Design an enzyme around this catalytic site. Structure first.
Site, PDB file in Angstrom:
ATOM      1  N   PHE A  84       9.963  52.973  34.781  1.00 39.18           N
ATOM      2  CA  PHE A  84       8.660  52.740  34.160  1.00 39.18           C
ATOM      3  C   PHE A  84       8.584  51.426  33.404  1.00 39.18           C
ATOM      4  CE2 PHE A  84      11.199  55.485  31.429  1.00 39.18           C
ATOM      5  CZ  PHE A  84      11.120  54.873  30.189  1.00 39.18           C
ATOM      6  N   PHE A  86       9.344  49.167  31.259  1.00 37.03           N
ATOM      7  CA  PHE A  86      10.425  48.816  30.318  1.00 37.03           C
ATOM      8  C   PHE A  86      11.316  50.002  29.915  1.00 37.03           C
ATOM      9  CE2 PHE A  86       7.727  45.404  30.765  1.00 37.03           C
ATOM     10  CZ  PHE A  86       6.616  45.392  29.934  1.00 37.03           C
TER      11      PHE A  86
HETATM   12 CU1  CUA Z   1      10.545  46.773  35.535  1.00 33.53          CU
HETATM   13 CU2  CUA Z   1      11.728  44.320  35.517  1.00 33.53          CU
END
Ligand code: CUA
Ligand code: HAS
Ligand code: HEM
Ligand SMILES: [Cu+2]
Ligand SMILES: [Xe]
Ligand SMILES: [Xe]
Ligand SMILES: [Xe]
Ligand SMILES: [Xe]
Ligand SMILES: [Xe]
Lengths: 166, 33, 557
Positions: A84, A86
């Site tokens: 996802f 980060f």
């Molecule tokens: Cu998600 Cu780089």
């Protein structure tokens, strides 16, 4: 001269092209070899497996992070990963060694990369598709997952973890 | 005048470089297998 | 309203200059971010300094979007449109449809500006690949579309020239340069369809609001349909100059016409049906089809391998004519004082480690080692940012005078040699740095200077990336200085603006005729290339278009 250099050049050209094609066919033969071996598991699954991204982490195998791992054979474990904006769920992914791990990865938002540092696991993760890869790690300890596809301002900070148990 | 010794040296270097690259990574592919 | 008689019987000269100027300005602007990116991968964060200089810059990635776009897309397309319209026109001594040729420039200019606005305003920080669901401003997509479509006019322009010349010379073989140009533009047309479909079917209605989903898999499949051949579209304009002008600059002759033609023929054949080599790490694409595409990609290396021999021999031949010695004498006999010779030669050197890097990436399974790492940027800077740009830079030493009439002083000539050597050297160091770290798993497209301790094992290559960053910063400055020195002087000789383009002699043989004649069957070969694309992409595309799964857009900057 000039005309004498023409025939010789064109002659050695034909021998260069014969050698070059041969060398490429050798490469084709060593790539085919890898495809027949165990190392070929990292090649993502060919058949399409569609999912709704907007409904991934509230229903189905990705919804519950404590469910992500599942024993599906005698020495086979399916992990339902979620790459996802980060971060990676679950964090950390805990799996035993000498076991065939069947990753099934997708995204709720954008395209991410799933690169397990020190392995051949390198797959693009696409929203509304499941990236299915098979891998048996042999080395036991700390496997870091890196996102190698630009996915926003926190992309350089998107690190995951595979906990593989001796 | 004769054989392109200079040209055949060049494509020899090119040939050697390709191999070092290909075989070197072909190795590293199996080591991470 | 015409001040220079030159531009009235060779008005193509003017239109060519504008394509060149616009292209090198974009090169300069885009290149400014280069050094900062190099330091970034040397674990040095110089961006607050850049932010103070350029206050519109919001992030590393906005910079990187501008760097890719302005250098890989704009500079390179405008250079192609310049070279692969002007060189055939001068070889044939035929005027290109000037109404259409200026129209293609305006398209490029309005398209650039339109797309430049949202990029400069941080509304389209999606990099030069603009992968969905990353959703930019509509004016980026519209801007890019118009900019790219400009090429379709160019294709028409060249085809037109070619038809007309076939008319005046019935039954004659297409002259060399023109032949390359034709199979180049035809190739580009077939290639462009992947990006046009993406734009027309998805990105444009998506950015405008018509739809709210875009399937990422089919979006990046269509992309890479155009995605790979476009690199050849960057390359072949350099190849044309290397085959047909470089030998002359060296003091020799092109040793083979039919080889050149065969090289270009193969590119027209194999440049398009190889996109899956960019998608080895993608799901939903059949592994067999990936192996297929990996084989064709090994094949598309053949043209380059041929090129390597043909050009090497032509530069050994030239060297011998200069008073060549033994095995390596011909090397030292060459005109190393001439920037128009040196620049491309150096680009070719670094192209060697660049090509091998390409063949590696092309080996299906071996990609997983290097995919999306700093290795890939390592690979292409040896290709595009070295060979192409260098060939571009050096070629200003004959092309700039020929269009403007402005001579080049000894000082500017030696200035060039510095800029060229530095650019080369700096690209080399960088190459080592990026490949090394790429093997050590360092991702690309990442602001890694903001996460210092993230990659400690990349200690020593991170030094190389710092060095290069400095080296290439200096080379760039000297380029701007030197370029503007030549563009802002009022020294003009109208006679060397009427001088012919230093085209090289072609050594021809007896066997040539029959092989050259079969290659001139362009209409046949164009359909062959068309079928190959249908076979390679058709089966997969049809399976992806029956199972569309559009996902909503995101802005993550
Ligand atoms: Cu998600 Cu780089
Ligand atoms: C303009 C630049 C382009 C060049 C051309 C280029 C050539 C190749 N590439 Fe590529 N490329 C790939 C495969 C190849 C192959 C097989 C070749 C071939 O065309 C290379 C053929 C070249 C040779 C076989 C070398 C011939 C050498 C010559 C001709 C020099 C001889 C010198 C002489 C004779 C001088 C002597 C002089 C004296 C004085 C002695 C693959 C894998 O299959 C990836 C995927 C990486 C990934 O996973 O993302 C890829 C990724 C890229 C990137 C990434 C795009 C992105 O953002 O994702 C783009 C920019 C790019 C550019 C270019 N690439 N490539
Ligand atoms: C001035 C000298 C240059 C330097 C120092 C430089 C440096 C860099 C660096 C360090 C990167 C990696 C950034 C990252 O992936 O995080 C990069 C990417 C890139 N460069 Fe260059 N570059 C230069 C010139 C050029 C030129 C001349 C071109 C093309 C003509 C070019 C095309 C590209 C492209 C297409 C990318 C990748 C963009 C992306 O992945 O989003 N660069 N450059
Ligand atoms: Cu490609
Ligand atoms: Xe593009
Ligand atoms: Xe586009
Ligand atoms: Xe653009
Ligand atoms: Xe387009
Ligand atoms: Xe590209």
């Amino acid at each position: 001269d000039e005309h004498k250099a023409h025939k010789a050049i064109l002659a050695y050209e034909k021998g260069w092209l014969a050698f070059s094609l041969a060398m490429l066919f050798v490469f084709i033969a060593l790539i085919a070899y890898t495809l027949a071996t165990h190392t070929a598991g990292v090649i993502p699954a060919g058949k399409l497996e569609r999912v709704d991204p907007t409904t991934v982490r509230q229903e189905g195998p990705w919804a519950d992070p404590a469910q992500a791992v599942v024993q599906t054979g005698p020495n086979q474990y399916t992990v339902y990963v979620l790459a996802f904006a980060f971060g990676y769920q679950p964090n950390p992914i805990e799996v035993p060694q000498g076991a065939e791990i069947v990753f099934k990865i997708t995204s709720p938002d954008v395209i991410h990369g799933f690169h397990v540092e020190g392995t051949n696991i390198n797959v693009e993760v696409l929203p509304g598709e499941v990236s299915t890869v098979r891998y048996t790690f042999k080395r036991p300890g700390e496997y870091r997952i890196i996102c190698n596809q630009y996915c926003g301002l926190g992309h350089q900070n998107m690190f995951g973890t595979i906990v593989v148990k001796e | 005048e004769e054989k392109p010794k200079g040209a055949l040296a060049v494509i020899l270097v090119l040939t050697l470089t390709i191999l070092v690259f290909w075989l070197g990574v072909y190795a590293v592919f199996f080591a991470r297998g | 309203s015409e001040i220079s008689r030159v531009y009235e019987a060779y008005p193509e000269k003017k239109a060519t200059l504008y394509f060149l100027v616009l292209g090198f300005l974009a090169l300069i602007v885009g290149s400014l971010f280069g050094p900062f990116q190099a330091l970034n991968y040397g674990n040095v964060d110089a961006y607050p300094l850049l932010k103070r200089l350029l206050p519109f810059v919001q992030s590393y990635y906005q910079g990187l979007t501008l760097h890719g776009v302005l250098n890989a897309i704009v500079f390179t397309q405008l250079f192609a449109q310049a070279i692969m319209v002007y060189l055939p026109a001068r070889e044939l001594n035929m005027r290109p449809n000037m109404g259409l040729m200026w129209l293609s420039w305006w398209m490029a200019f309005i398209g650039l500006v339109v797309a430049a606005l949202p990029l400069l305003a941080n509304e389209a920080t999606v990099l030069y690949t603009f992968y969905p669901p990353l959703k930019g401003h509509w004016a980026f997509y519209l801007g890019a579309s118009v900019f790219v479509l400009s090429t379709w006019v160019s294709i028409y322009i060249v085809l037109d020239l070619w038809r007309r010349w076939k008319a005046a010379n019935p039954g004659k073989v297409t002259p060399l340069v023109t032949y390359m140009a034709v199979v180049f533009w035809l190739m580009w047309f077939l290639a462009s369809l992947g990006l046009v479909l993406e734009a027309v079917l998805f990105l444009l209605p998506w950015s405008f609001g018509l739809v709210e989903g875009v399937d990422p898999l089919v979006a990046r499949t269509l992309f890479w349909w155009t995605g790979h051949p476009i690199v050849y579209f960057w390359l072949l304009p350099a190849y044309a100059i290397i085959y047909t002008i470089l030998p002359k600059q060296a003091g020799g002759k092109l040793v083979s016409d039919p080889m050149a033609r065969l090289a270009f023929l193969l590119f027209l054949l194999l440049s398009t049906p190889v996109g899956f080599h960019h998608q080895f790490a993608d799901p939903g694409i059949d592994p067999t089809w990936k192996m297929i595409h990996s084989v064709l990609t090994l094949f598309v290396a053949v043209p380059s391998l041929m090129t390597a021999f043909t050009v090497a021999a032509s530069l050994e031949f030239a060297g011998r004519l200069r008073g060549g010695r033994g095995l390596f004498g011909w090397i030292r006999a060459l005109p190393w004082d001439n920037p128009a010779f040196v620049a491309p030669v150096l680009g070719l050197l670094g192209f060697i480690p660049g090509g091998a890097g390409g063949i590696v990436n092309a080996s299906f399974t071996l990609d997983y080692v290097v995919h999306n790492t700093a290795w890939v940027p390592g690979h292409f800077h040896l290709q595009v940012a070295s060979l192409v740009t260098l060939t571009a830079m050096g070629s200003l030493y004959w092309l700039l005078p020929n269009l403007t009439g402005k001579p080049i002083s000894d000082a500017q000539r030696r200035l060039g040699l510095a800029v060229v050597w530095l650019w080369f050297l700096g690209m080399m160091i960088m190459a080592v740095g990026l490949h090394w770290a790429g093997l050590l798993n360092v991702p690309r497209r990442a602001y890694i200077a903001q996460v210092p301790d993230a990659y400690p094992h990349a200690a020593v290559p991170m030094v190389f990336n710092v060095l290069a960053g400095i080296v290439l910063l200096v080379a760039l400055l000297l380029f701007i200085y030197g370029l503007f020195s030549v563009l802002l002087s009022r020294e003009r000789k109208p006679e060397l603006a009427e001088a012919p383009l230093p085209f090289a002699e072609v050594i021809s043989g007896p066997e040539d005729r029959r092989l050259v004649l079969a290659m001139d069957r362009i209409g046949f070969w164009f359909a062959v290339a068309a079928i190959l694309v249908v076979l390679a992409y058709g089966p997969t595309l049809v399976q992806l278009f029956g199972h569309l799964n559009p996902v909503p857009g995101w802005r993550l900057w």
